[PDB]
Ligand binder design. Structure first.
Ligand code: ADP
Ligand code: ADP
Ligand code: ADP
Lengths: 445, 93, 54, 437, 436
C-alpha cells in the first residue's frame, strides 16, 4: 500500500504460454518476442535449479526494455526466490573493496529454505504462582494463561522461571511460549488492563488479547540467503550488521565453512538450496577488476545466474584505454550468451502508451493517443510516457476528465524533449556557460 | 609519561541544578564506575552472607584492563635514590 | 515557617550574628541594625516571640 | 526587524486558479511559461499518485531557476517536505556518493502522525510505594498538587525507577508525561524554602495551572528520520547524554533490507489510519557537478515505487560530462538520463522587467529610491549584470544614510559604482596590469 | 589581551574613519588605500545593521597591498561578541570531513545567537565556618558567618551545603562565590590577611547579575545532534552533522527570535586565498549565500586570470564567472614612497625601534625598489644588529649590514641564475663537485 505508480509498474511478468511462446501482448509486455522467449528460457533454467553460474547479457539501444524484461523475469520468478537488482555504481565503496562487493551481491542472490514447526501458546497471563524450591534448583511454577475462550494451568521449569524474570512479566501481560523450542516473547499489555495504571511505562505496549484456541500449531518456511549467514557467523552480535550495513570484508574461511556445512545440511536434508538471479544493471559502469572477478567467480557451484544490461556500443572499457564491444572485455563476452533487443514500430509504441495510460488511470482519447504515438516515434517512448501524466494534470486544471488534443499540445509546448533543448541551446551559446567557463551575462553589450 | 593530564571540559550552566545532577550522573555513572573497579572483600562478605544477596546478583566488577607491570600503573614516577648516585658523575665515581 | 525581616516585615534573607535580628538588605543593616541601642533587640524579638532574654 | 536574503522578496508562483500566469504577482515578474510549467508540476505533486518524476530547468545564469524551486517549495507549503541540495554535497568522505543520493531520496518523503500529549505538573505531597512481593514494588501511589488543586496517580515500577533516577523526594515539582513516561524534576517547592537558610535546592514556585494538561499535536517526520532512528551502529539514541558517547558512530551504507522492513512497518501503520504519507520534492541545484556514477545510480533509482519528484537545475551548454573525457551533452546531463527528464527552458530578461525586479527588491528591503536613480540602476544592470545591481542596492542606502538622507539619489549610485567594481571592470584592470593585478 | 607578541598586523586597531565614513589619511594604525577603507567601512556598517544576509565581497589586488590588513581592520573594528571567522583556503580539504560540510561549518560558526539570563549569586568574605559532626555522621548541621565591606550575616547550613563546603576546603578569611541554584562554590581568593590576594567584595549580597551569552549556531548544531556532545566543539570530531538537525535548529532560532527570548547576531566570514578552493566548493558557496542565516563573506585573492582548481580552463581572479557575478569587488592599489615610509615608521614604532632619519629613508628606498615586507622584516633585524654594537639607535650602517647579510627576492634569483649548476634543476641534475 506504500508503493506508488512507477514507470515499470504495469509489468506483472513475462507474457508466456505453457510452451514458452510469447503472446503478442500479455502481462504488460508488448512485442520483443524473441527477447521474451530467451528470457523465458533463462527463467526455466533458473526454476529447474540444476545449472550454476551462467552469465547472460541483455544488449540493446536505449528505451528498448532491457530493464523492463529483467523486472518481468523477476515478477514471473515469484516470491521466496532471491532477486538482487543493483546498478554498477553501488560496487564502488569506501570501506568495502569492489571484489568483496561483488561477493556480497553473489551471496545475496542465492539462498536456502528452512522449515519450521511451531507450537505456540499465545495468551494473557492471569497469575504466576511460583513453587519456590528449598534448594533453589528446578523451581516450579503454575502459569495461569488465558485467552478470551479458555484457560488452563501449566508446569514450568527453572530456566523458564529465569526467562520470565530476566524480562519482567506480570499479570495481564500478553506472551507466547513455544513448547518444542522454549522460545519466550512478551507482546505487551492486554487492552483490558489499560485503565489500572494512570501513567504508562516507557516500554509498555498495548496489544489485543488473543482469540480462539490457546495452543496453536503452525509450520513456517524460511528463506535465508547465504550472505545473511555470512554476516551472522562473522560477529558475536551480528544481526545488527544485517541492517546497518557494516559488514567489513568477511574472510574466506568463514565462507568456506558456511559453504561446506550448507552442503552437508543439504546432505542430511534440513535445508534445500534455492538458486536466484543477480541483475547487474548498467554493467559498463564497472572497472576491469570487477569484470575479471565476475569471470572467475561464476565457476563455483554456489553461483547464481547473472543478468547484465548494456546500452553501450563499441566503447572503451573503464580502467583501460582500448575500445571493446558493448563496453565489456572479450573474456566476459566469451562466457556470455547475448539477448539482443530491437526497437519498436508505431503499433508497439501505441500499445505500450495505451498500457501506461491504463496504469496511471489516465483516460486517453483516440486522437490524443495518435498524437502521443507520433511524438513517441519521433523523439522517444519515455518522453511521451512522461507527457501523459502532465497532460492529465493540464486537463484536470481545465475542469475536464479525459485528455484532448489541446491538453497534449499544451503539454508538448510547456515541456521540452532532448532534441529541442539541444537545438535551443545550440542557437544561443552566448547565454550558457561553455566548456571553457566563458559566459555573457550582460543582456546588452 | 604524559606531560599534561586534564579532566574533561567542565560545562557550567548558571541557575539550574538539573544540569549539575545530569553531569554528575554522566561523569560518575554508578554501573560503569562500579564496572571499572572492584568491590572490597569485606563488603562482598557482608553482602553475600550477612544480607543474603546471591552471587549472581552482584554488580559486575573487575573489567578494567590489567596494566603491563606495576610500573605502568600510574604516571607518577618516584625519584629513585639509585638514580641520585648516577645523576652526578663525581658522585658515581 | 517563612522568615521575615524583623524591622521592615519583608523577606529576611539575612540575620545579624551579633544581636540575632533578621534584616532585609544593606541600607536596613547599616542604618538601623548596626546603630541599634542595646536592650531594644530583645524588644524586637519579643514580637516574634523569641525575646530570649528572661 | 526581519533579515533579507536573496530570495525573500518572492513568495510564490503567483498563478491563478485557472492555471494562467499573472505578469506581476507572487514576487515574480515575467517568466510566464516556466511559471505555468512549474504550476503543472506542483499540481502533479499535490496529486500524490506518481513516483520518480524528474524535471530539469534549463537557462542561463541569473534567470530565476532557484527562484522557481523556492516558489515550488512555498506553493507546496510546509506540510510537504522539501530537501534543497547542492550537487557538490553528494561527494562525502564517510559514506559513498550513491548512498548519500539514496539518503536524500528517503529524506524527501514524509509522514504525519497524530498524537496526544497528556502531562502532570505539580508538587509531590505523597510518595507511597506498595511492595506486594511475589524486594520488588508492585506499584507506587504518587499525589501531585498545584494551585488549582491536587490529583493522585497510580504508577508502574518503571516510572518509580525513573523517579529514583531523578532523586525525587517529597516536595519536589516534577514533570510526568503519561504516554512516553518521561520524569523530569523541576526543583523543590517554594513553600519548602526556609527549612535551611542556604542549600543547593533550586526552589521553583508552584505551578499555577491544573495538574493534568492534555493537548494534541502532529508529528512531521520523514522516512529518513525513521531509518536513522532504527539503524544505529552504536545504540542508545533514547538516553539523554550531554557528554557524548566514547566512540563516535560513522555514517554507514544502509542496506535494502532495512528499507524494505521500514516500508512494511510504515504500510502497516498507514493501513491502520495512524499515519499519512506525504511525498515531497528533492531539489538538486547545479546537477552539472554530478559525477557519471551518480548519474548511473540516479538512472537506477528513478524507477522505485517510493521515489519523490526530483528537480534538477543546470546552466551549461555543450559540456563534457564530469568523470568522462569525450561525452559532450546538453547541460552536463548524460543522454540516457535525459530521456527520463522533462526539460523546461528559462529565458533571460530585458530592461523593463529588470527595473521591476530592482524596484521590488527596493520595496522589500525598504530603501526609498528616486526615479532617475532607478533608471540609472536599470541601465547599469543591463550593462554590467543583474546581480551587481541587486547587490549595490544596499551600499547606496548606506551612503544615503551617512549623508543623513532616506532617499537614494544619483550621487550615491555613482559613489557606489566607483567604490565597488563588477567582474568586467575588474577583469579589464586584471588584464592590463602584469604583477598579479 | 591573551598571548599577544608582535605580529605582522598588530599595529592595526581598526579603520580610520569619521562619522561620515571619510577615511583619515593616517588613523588607527592604518595609512593609505582611501577608497578601499571607505568600501570596507560601508561593509562594516552593513554588518552592524544586521538586516542584510549572504553578501559576498572580494578584495583583489597585487600582493603586499593590504588586503589582509583591510580585513584585520574590519575584524578589529567589529567589536566583541559579533562573530568573525578567519580561515585559509587550504583548510577545508579534510581527511574526515567533506569539503562542502566543512564550508557549512565555517558558515555556521559565524552566526551567533544572543541570550540574556539572570542568576542569583552570593559573593562575600567568610568570617568563620562552624560545623559540628554527629555521633556517627547521619546528619550534619553547621553555621556559616559571611561578610562584605557593608553587610554581615549568619547562615544555617543543611546537608548539601556542608558537603559542598567540605569539598573545596573553605577556611576563615576566604572570599568565595556561592551559586544557590546549582550548588557551585568557586574560590575567588584569600582576602587581605597578612598571616592569592583579592579585595573584599562590596555589599548587597544575593544580588541580581545579568550575563549575556553569545553562542554560535555551530555549537547549537553540535549540541542538538544527540550523538555529539559538546566535547566535539573542542576535540573537533563532529563527523558530518546531518541536515535534519540543522533545519530543526533553524526553525527553533527563528521561533526564538519571534518569541522575544533571543536576538540574532550576524557576523563576518573571511577566507584567505580563496583561489585555492576547487570548483564544487565554489558551487556550494554560490548556492549557500542564498540562505537567510548566512554571514557576509569576505574573500581575499591576488591571482590574475589563473586556472581554476579542478578544471582545465582559466578564469579571472581564479574564480568562475558566476561567483564573480555573485560578488562585488574591492580593488586595492599599490603604495607610493610616502605611504611606504609611514608604514615603516608605524612598524618601527610598534616593534620599539628608535631609528635614524637617514636609516629610515634608506629602508624606505629599499621598500620602494623591493616589496614592503622585506623592509618590514629588515627593521627588527637591523635593531638586533644595533644592540650588537651596544647602540640603542639604529643607524645607516646597521641597515646596510642587514641588506648585506639577508638577501631579498631578486638578488637571490640572480644569484641562483648565475650559478645554476651548483643547485638542482627540474630534471634533478646537480654538479656537487667544485673542480673538474
Ligand atoms: N516490452 C515492453 N513492454 C511494455 N513496456 C515497455 C517494454 N519495453 C520497454 N517498455 C517501456 O520502456 C520504458 C523504460 O524502458 P527501459 O527498460 O528503461 O529501456 P532500456 O532497457 O532501453 O533502458 C518503460 O516506461 C516501459 O513502459
Ligand atoms: N521572474 C523573476 N521575478 C523576480 N525576481 C527574479 C525573477 N527571476 C530571477 N529573479 C531574482 O534573481 C535572483 C537570482 O536568481 P537565481 O535563481 O539565483 O538565478 P539562477 O536561475 O541563475 O540561479 C533571485 O534572488 C530572484 O529574486
Ligand atoms: N594601509 C596599511 N596600513 C598599515 N599597514 C599596512 C597597510 N597596508 C599594508 N600594511 C602592512 O603591510 C604588510 C603586508 O601587507 P599584507 O596585508 O600582507 O598585504 P596582502 O593583504 O596583499 O597580503 C603587513 O604587515 C601590513 O601590516
Amino acid at each position: 500500500s506504500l508503493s506508488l505508480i512507477a514507470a515499470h509498474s504495469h509489468i506483472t511478468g513475462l507474457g508466456l504460454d505453457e510452451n514458452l511462446q510469447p503472446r503478442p501482448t500479455s502481462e504488460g509486455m508488448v512485442g520483443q518476442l524473441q527477447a521474451r522467449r530467451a528470457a523465458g528460457v533463462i527463467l526455466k533454467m533458473v526454476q529447474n535449479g540444476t545449472i550454476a553460474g551462467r552469465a547472460v547479457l541483455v544488449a540493446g539501444p536505449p528505451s528498448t526494455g532491457k530493464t523492463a524484461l529483467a523486472m518481468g523475469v523477476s515478477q514471473s520468478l515469484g516470491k521466496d526466490v532471491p532477486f538482487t537488482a543493483i546498478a554498477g555504481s553501488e560496487i564502488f565503496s569506501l570501506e568495502l573493496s569492489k571484489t568483496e562487493a561483488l561477493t556480497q551481491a553473489f551471496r545475496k542472490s542465492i539462498g536456502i529454505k528452512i522449515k519450521e514447526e511451531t507450537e505456540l501458546i499465545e495468551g494473557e497471563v492471569v497469575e504466576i504462582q511460583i513453587d519456590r524450591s528449598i534448594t533453589g534448583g528446578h523451581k516450579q511454577g503454575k502459569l495461569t494463561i488465558k485467552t478470551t475462550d479458555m484457560e488452563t494451568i501449566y508446569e514450568l521449569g527453572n530456566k523458564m522461571i529465569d526467562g520470565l524474570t530476566k524480562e519482567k512479566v506480570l499479570a495481564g501481560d500478553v506472551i507466547s511460549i513455544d513448547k518444542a523450542s522454549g522460545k519466550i516473547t512478551k507482546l505487551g499489555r492486554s487492552f483490558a488492563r489499560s485503565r489500572d495504571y494512570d501513567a504508562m511505562g516507557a516500554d509498555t505496549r498495548f496489544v489485543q488479547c488473543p482469540e480462539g484456541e490457546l495452543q496453536k500449531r503452525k509450520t513456517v518456511v524460511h528463506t535465508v540467503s547465504l550472505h545473511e549467514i555470512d554476516v551472522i557467523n562473522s560477529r558475536t552480535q551480528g544481526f545488527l550488521a544485517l541492517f546497518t550495513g557494516d559488514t567489513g570484508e568477511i574472510r574466506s574461511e568463514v565462507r568456506d565453512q558456511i559453504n561446506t556445512k550448507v552442503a552437508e545440511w543439504k546432505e542430511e536434508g534440513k535445508a534445500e538450496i534455492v538458486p536466484g538471479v543477480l541483475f547487474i544493471d548498467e554493467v559498463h559502469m564497472l572497472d576491469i577488476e570487477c569484470f575479471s572477478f565476475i569471470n572467475r567467480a561464476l565457476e563455483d557451484e554456489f553461483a547464481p545466474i547473472v543478468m547484465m544490461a548494456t546500452n553501450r556500443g563499441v566503447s572503451k572499457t573503464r580502467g583501460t584505454n582500448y575500445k571493446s564491444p558493448h563496453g565489456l572485455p572479450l573474456d566476459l563476452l566469451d562466457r556470455s550468451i547475448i539477448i539482443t533487443t530491437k526497437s519498436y514500430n508505431e503499433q508497439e509504441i501505441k500499445t505500450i502508451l495505451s498500457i501506461r495510460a491504463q496504469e496511471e488511470e489516465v483516460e486517453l482519447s483516440s486522437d490524443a493517443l495518435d498524437l502521443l504515438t507520433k511524438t513517441g516515434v519521433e523523439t522517444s517512448l519515455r518522453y511521451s510516457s512522461n507527457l501523459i501524466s502532465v497532460a492529465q494534470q493540464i486537463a484536470m486544471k481545465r475542469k475536464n476528465n479525459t485528455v484532448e488534443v489541446e491538453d497534449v499540445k499544451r503539454a508538448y509546448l510547456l515541456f521540452l524533449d532532448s532534441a529541442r533543448s539541444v537545438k535551443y541551446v545550440q542557437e544561443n551559446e552566448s547565454q550558457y556557460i561553455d566548456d571553457q567557463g566563458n559566459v555573457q551575462i550582460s543582456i546588452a553589450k | 609519561h604524559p606531560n599534561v593530564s586534564a579532566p574533561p571540559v567542565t560545562i557550567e550552566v548558571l541557575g539550574s541544578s538539573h544540569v549539575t545532577n545530569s553531569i554528575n550522573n554522566e561523569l560518575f555513572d554508578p554501573l560503569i564506575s562500579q564496572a571499572l573497579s572492584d568491590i572490597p572483600a569485606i563488603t562482598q562478605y557482608n553482602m553475600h552472607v550477612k544480607k543474603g544477596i546471591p552471587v549472581e546478583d552482584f554488580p559486575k566488577t573487575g573489567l578494567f584492563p590489567e596494566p603491563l607491570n606495576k610500573n605502568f600503573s600510574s604516571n607518577i614516577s618516584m625519584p629513585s635514590m639509585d638514580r641520585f648516585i648516577t645523576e652526578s658523575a663525581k658522585l658515581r665515581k | 515557617a517563612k522568615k521575615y525581616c524583623d524591622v521592615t516585615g519583608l523577606k529576611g534573607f539575612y540575620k545579624s550574628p551579633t544581636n540575632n535580628i533578621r534584616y532585609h538588605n544593606a541600607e536596613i543593616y547599616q542604618l538601623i541594625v548596626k546603630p541599634m541601642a542595646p536592650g531594644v533587640d530583645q524588644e524586637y524579638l519579643k514580637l516574634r516571640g523569641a525575646n530570649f532574654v528572661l | 526587524v526581519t533579515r533579507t536574503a536573496a530570495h525573500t522578496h518572492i513568495k510564490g508562483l503567483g498563478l491563478d486558479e485557472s492555471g494562467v500566469a499573472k505578469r506581476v504577482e507572487g514576487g515574480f515578474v515575467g517568466q510566464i511559461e516556466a511559471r505555468e510549467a512549474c504550476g503543472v508540476i506542483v499540481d502533479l505533486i499535490k496529486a500524490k499518485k506518481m513516483s520518480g518524476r524528474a524535471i530539469l530547468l534549463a537557462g542561463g545564469p541569473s534567470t530565476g531557476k532557484t527562484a522557481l524551486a523556492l516558489a515550488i517549495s512555498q506553493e507546496l507549503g510546509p506540510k510537504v517536505p522539501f530537501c534543497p541540495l547542492v550537487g557538490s554535497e553528494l561527494y562525502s568522505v564517510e559514506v559513498k556518493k550513491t548512498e548519500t543520493l539514496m539518503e536524500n531520496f528517503r529524506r524527501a518523503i514524509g509522514l504525519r502522525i497524530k498524537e496526544t500529549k497528556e502531562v502532570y505538573e505539580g508538587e509531590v505531597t505523597e510518595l507511597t510505594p506498595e511492595d506486594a512481593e511475589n524486594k520488588t514494588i508492585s506499584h507506587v501511589i504518587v499525589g501531585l498538587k498545584s494551585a488549582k488543586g491536587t490529583k493522585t496517580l497510580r504508577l508502574d515500577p518503571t516510572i518509580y525507577e525513573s523517579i529514583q533516577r531523578e532523586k525525587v523526594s517529597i516536595g519536589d515539582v516534577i514533570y510526568i508525561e503519561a504516554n512516553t513516561g518521561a520524569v523530569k524534576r523541576v526543583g523543590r517547592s517554594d513553600a519548602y524554602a526556609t527549612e535551611f537558610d542556604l542549600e543547593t535546592e533550586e526552589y521553583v514556585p508552584l505551578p499555577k495551572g491544573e495538574v493534568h494538561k492534555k493537548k494534541e499535536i502532529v508529528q512531521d517526520v520523514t522516512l529518513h528520520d525513521l531509518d536513522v532512528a532504527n539503524a544505529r551502529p552504536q545504540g542508545g539514541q533514547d538516553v539523554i547524554s550531554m557528554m557524548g558517547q566514547l566512540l563516535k558512530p560513522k555514517k554507514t551504507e544502509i542496506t535494502e533490507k532495512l528499507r524494505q522492513e521500514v516500508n512494511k512497518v510504515v504500510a502497516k501503520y498507514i493501513d491502520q489510519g495512524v499515519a499519512e504519507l506525504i511525498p515531497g520534492v528533492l531539489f538538486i541545484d547545479e546537477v552539472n557537478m554530478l559525477d557519471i556514477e551518480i548519474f548511473t545510480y540516479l538512472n537506477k533509482a528513478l524507477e522505485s515505487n517510493i521515489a519523490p519528484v526530483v528537480v534538477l537545475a543546470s546552466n551549461r551548454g555543450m559540456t563534457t560530462v564530469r568523470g568522462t573525457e569525450d561525452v559532450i551533452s546538453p547541460h552536463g546531463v548524460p543522454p540516457d538520463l535525459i530521456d527520463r527528464l522533462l526539460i523546461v527552458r528559462t529565458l533571460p530578461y530585458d530592461k523593463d522587467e529588470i527595473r521591476t525586479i530592482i524596484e521590488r527588491r527596493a520595496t522589500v528591503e525598504r530603501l526609498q529610491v528616486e526615479s532617475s536613480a532607478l533608471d540609472l540602476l536599470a541601465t547599469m544592470g543591463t550593462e554590467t549584470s543583474l546581480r551587481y545591481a541587486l547587490q549595490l542596492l544596499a551600499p547606496c542606502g548606506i551612503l544615503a544614510q551617512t549623508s543623513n538622507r532616506k532617499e537614494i539619489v544619483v550621487n550615491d549610485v555613482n559613489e557606489a559604482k566607483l567604490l565597488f567594481l563588477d567582474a568586467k571592470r575588474s577583469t579589464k584592470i586584471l588584464e592590463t596590469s602584469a604583477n598579479y593585478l
